[PDB]
């Protein structure tokens, strides 16, 4: 399963990691200590 | 009632105001301190609501300005009809108005 690895990582970097980063950085943007 | 309501000789025809440039306003009828004076002269050139603050003089100005524009349009029409007269193939176009 090595021709299937692009199918794993292109969503995981391009859809999932952007959701993670956008959510985390939006929380960091609006935080207040 | 709707009278004629005109007045005789409100403005003296002379080239004195041709000489002094930017005569039509307070801050331009002094002379160029800078080169912005020229641009503000041409920019406020037809801003008749800025020159004189009454609708009488403004309305006379725009009326005679419309006459100048009509003279220009008639001159342009004369040009087109004349270039169609002496500098044209209008007869040859009438003879064959599909390949000429």
């Amino acid at each position: 399963t090595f021709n299937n690895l692009p199918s794993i990582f292109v969503p995981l970097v391009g859809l999932v990691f952007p959701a993670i980063a956008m959510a985390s950085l939006f929380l960091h943007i609006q935080k207040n200590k | 009632e709707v009278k004629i309501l005109v007045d005789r000789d409100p403005i003296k025809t002379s080239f004195e105001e041709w000489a002094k440039p930017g005569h039509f306003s307070r801050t331009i009828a002094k002379g160029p301190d800078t080169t912005t004076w020229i641009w503000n002269l041409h920019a406020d050139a037809h801003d008749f609501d800025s020159h004189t603050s009454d609708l009488e003089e403004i309305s006379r100005k725009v009326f005679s300005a419309h006459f100048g524009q009509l003279s220009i349009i008639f001159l342009w029409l004369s040009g087109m009809y004349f270039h169609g007269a002496r500098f044209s193939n209008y007869e040859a176009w009438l003879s064959d108005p599909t390949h000429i």
């Binding site: - | 000489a19 440039p21 002379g31 160029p32 301190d33 020229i38």
Partner: protein, 153 residues
Amino acid sequence: DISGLTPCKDSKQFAKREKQQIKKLESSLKLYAPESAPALALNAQIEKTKRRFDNYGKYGLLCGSDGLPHLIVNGDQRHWGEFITPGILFLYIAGWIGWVGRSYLIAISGEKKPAMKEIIIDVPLASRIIFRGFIWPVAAYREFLNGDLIAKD
């Protein structure tokens, strides 16, 4: 024969360009009557083209592989007429203009409001100043030596 360029009176591509343009004009000359006015204008343009190519032949122009007059602006005497003899004729005329408009600006520099002579040019003063720049190079030379060319702030 400098820069690997055959002269234009000897270049076959130059004559081919001449013949091509002449045929292009003659193909437009056939549509008109031989005595008509468009035909006479086309024939005048044809003689203009022919003597233009002859004159580019005789004036030492060099033609490349494309077959077009190239200008050798390096300094070779054979081609001074391409750049330097016009160039001096520019720097004269240009230096006329700047020596006039400068001199005028010095002649209206000592007025009360000297800006109303920038937009309303004194034609007598300007006509007196215009021919001062005829022999401008000696005036500019001497004013450089006398220090009157550069303001001392």
